[PDB]
Amino acid sequence: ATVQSPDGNIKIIISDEQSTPSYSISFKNKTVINNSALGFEFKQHAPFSNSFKITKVQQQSTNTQWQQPWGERQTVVDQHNEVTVTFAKPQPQGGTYSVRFKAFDSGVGFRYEVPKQAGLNNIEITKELTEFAVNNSHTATAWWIPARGWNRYEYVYNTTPLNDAALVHTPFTFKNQDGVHISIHEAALVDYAAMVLNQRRPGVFQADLTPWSSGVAVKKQGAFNTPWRTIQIGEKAVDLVNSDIILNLNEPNKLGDVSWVKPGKYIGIWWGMHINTHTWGSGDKHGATTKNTKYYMDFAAKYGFDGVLVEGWNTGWDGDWFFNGDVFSFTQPYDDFDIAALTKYSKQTGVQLIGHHETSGNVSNYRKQMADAFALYEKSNVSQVKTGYVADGGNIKRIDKNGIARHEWHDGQFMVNEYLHNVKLAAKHKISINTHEPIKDTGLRRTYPNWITREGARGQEFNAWGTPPNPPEHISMLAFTRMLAGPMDFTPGIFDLSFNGLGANTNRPQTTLAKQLALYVVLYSPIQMAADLPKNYLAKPDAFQFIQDVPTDWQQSIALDGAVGDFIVFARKERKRDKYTGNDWYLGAVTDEQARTIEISLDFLDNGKQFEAHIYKDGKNAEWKNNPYDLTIEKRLVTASDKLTLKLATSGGTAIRFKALL
């Protein structure tokens, strides 16, 4: 059986001649994915492996478009060809299952659909046999983070030969020697275990499902489907970025009117704890006080921020909070945090309190208080909540039905369901969720638009204490790996880079100032933090103007140019909403450890319109180690027929507002 992308360049052949059912993929008539197995092993049920034959193929196709409530673009086009391939094995130990393939011009998605059948009752998947056999893996290059490690998704990316990527998280991005870029991920991860990729024979990446503590991967009753497995394929690195395949593979919005989900910018009592000017726990340096929160709300009201995150407001942080998962209260504030007073102040100032639920990994203590916690927040005019699950890999703590503690993975079926329960319950309170230490993004924001963002990668916080901090190449790695999954709460915008000293050997963002501004356009998120202490913004008001101006919701986005681990350039057009007319374009560019010159056409600008470019760029002598603050801000009239030369300093960047005139 064969299905092809609409343009014909991606061709998938589904076969039953190998020991198992299998598939392979060519791009422009060169094989990029060799014969790759399909099937399942179960704890008790007989396997779905060899001796299955194709009995039926059903072809259909889609050419439609839909509108996002918020996002990186307003209109999403869905054009694909589809085939459902049915496999059957005769008894004894027979069975049937289908695999549905969707072929887009930018990649392919497939999932298993196992129908109701005799003897398929309570089953436990112990292995998914799905492979991704990369052709010519010995000359391919990969950029990846390890899976099943103690620090979850929070690793810097490795640059290695593909054959050295032994056990990896997704999105898993690599290029072959032809320069074709490929990224493997999944979409609509619901009631199932996350897929890790386990390289078996060289180049053969086998699905490795993150298990329950008991050892099985997925518990199902009767007929079931898997999430989608996704393979993005493009001639250029930016072709991976500019695809909507992850969103297109998710179910449509199930929450109805979601106008109560508000993209915007926020600040927080937050960074001070990370740089040790404040504590989460009580005492003379406690961050979360009524006085401090009101001071931040005043700043937010004056400078155009929608909300103030406050961490450490609830009892349970005293001592070593990493170990306090059992004792956190999610309803009882510290005595110096007056939530009724701050509720009144929120209405006075128009600035909202952003809630915070850190679990330190104990999800049962959170679950038992969750309904009361969200009721308190709804009563308190809180519309967004940041959640947290700080614990080492495999050390989520739950209490089972018999009162016995079990350790689970953040990305097993148990936690996959636990996260979605939190999001769905929050939606009943008109609360949106920003998940730290999350499950990776698989596009579920389409189905549940209050799941607005997540961390799930090393963000700005590792630049306060990472030892080492994020390297100069980190952003240009994220853009082609983590950011392919969906929005990230990176908390950009650190203006004081000197709190630990300058140079290359201290814990600090290893970037220039202009690169911090560029992050607001390079790293998409519907909520963007201005992460620094307010006084540090007041010290640099001209630079701060870009953060005040920049939107977080876009009617269109285009990655114009880039290379994994080297650089990326984004142009985005603001969505018409709130103060934003919908006429301005924005650009952000960042580089890695190397200074880079990038030539950019401005032909993304609307034809026949005049713009005033407000350009924030590295100064002539800027360099991140000892001269990160040199900055030039320039105004220049431009139209779509003009061009720009970006001159990025070492770990530098450029941010531009293209202000539409009249």
Ligand X SMILES: C[C@H]1O[C@H](O[C@H]2[C@H](O)[C@@H](O)[C@@H](O[C@H]3[C@H](O)[C@@H](O)[C@@H](O)O[C@@H]3CO)O[C@@H]2CO)[C@H](O)[C@@H](O)[C@@H]1N[C@H]1C=C(CO)[C@@H](O)[C@H](O)[C@H]1O
As measured in angstroms, the least distance from the Cβ of 165 to ligand X is 21
For tokens 């983590």, the residue is 482
Query: Shortest approach of Cl ion to residue 490 CB, angstroms?
Result: 8
State yes or no: residue 455 binds ligand X (CB under 6 A). Answer: yes
Give 463 or 516: the residue with its C-beta nearer to ligand X.
463
Which string of DSSP letters, residue by residue, matches 286-300?
BS--HHHHHHHHHHH
> Is 437 assigned to a binding site?
yes
Residues 384-403 interacting with ligand X (rule: CB under 6 A): 388, 390
Nearer to Mg ion, 22 or 650 (CB): 650
Exposure of 579 by Cβ count < 10 A (0-12 exposed, 13-18 middle, 19+ buried)? exposed
Pick the binder of Mg ion from 592, 598, 624, 650 (CB under 5 A): 592
The residue (of 14 and 464) whose beta carbon lies closer to Cl ion is 464
Cβ closer to Ca ion: 100 or 436? Answer: 436
Q: Is 146 in the site for ligand X (CB under 6 A)?
A: no
Residue 532 in contact with ligand X, rule: CB under 6 A: no
Shortest distance in whole angstroms from residue 523 CB to ligand X: 15
455 has binding-site annotation: yes
Q: Give the range of 203-211, 412-420, 461-469, 536-544 binding ligand X by CB under 6 A.
A: 461-469
Footprint on residues 128-157 left by Cl ion (CB under 5 A)? 152-154
The secondary structure element, H or E, covering residue 153 is none
Show the site string, 471-510: x = touches Cl ion by CB under 5 A, - = not: ---x------------------------------------
Q: Supply the minimum distance, in Å, between the C-beta of residue 487 and Ca ion.
A: 16
In sequence order, the 6+-apart residues with CB closer than 8 A to the CB of 389 are: 359, 361, 363, 396, 410, 415, 435, 436, 437, 438
- Known binding residue 634? Answer is no
According to DSSP, the residues that pair with 283 across neighbouring strands are none
- In angstroms, give the least distance from the CB of 284 to ligand X: 20
d(CA 332, CA 567): 46
| Tokens, residue 248 | 């297109």
Beta bridge partners of residue 410, listed in sequence order: none
Q: Which of 455, 458, 527, 459 has the alpha carbon at shortest distance from 494?
A: 459
**Residue closer to Cl ion (CB basis): 45 or 474:** 474
Q: Counting every residue, how long is the chain? A: 662
* Alpha helix ranges (H) inside 227-362: 237-241, 245-248, 271-274, 290-303, 339-349
Omega before 468 within 30 of 0, i.e. cis: yes
- Give the interface with Ca ion as residue ranges (CB under 5 A): 436
Q: How far apart are CA 189 and CA 187, in angstroms?
A: 6
- Cβ closer to ligand X: 48 or 266? 266
454 binds Cl ion, rule: CB under 5 A? no
Buried b (16+ CB within 10 A) or exposed e, 209-222: bbbbbeebbbbbee
Question: Which of Cl ion, Mg ion, ligand X, none binds 418 (CB below 5-8 Å, type-dependent)?
Answer: none
Query: Minimal distance in Å, beta carbon 591 to Mg ion?
Result: 8
Distance CA 223, CA 234 (A): 35
Provide the binding-site residues for Mg ion, judged by CB under 5 A: 473, 565-566, 592
Q: Specify binding-site residues.
A: 154, 437, 455, 461, 565-566, 592
Q: Which residues are part of a known binding site for Ca(2+)?
A: 154, 437, 455, 461
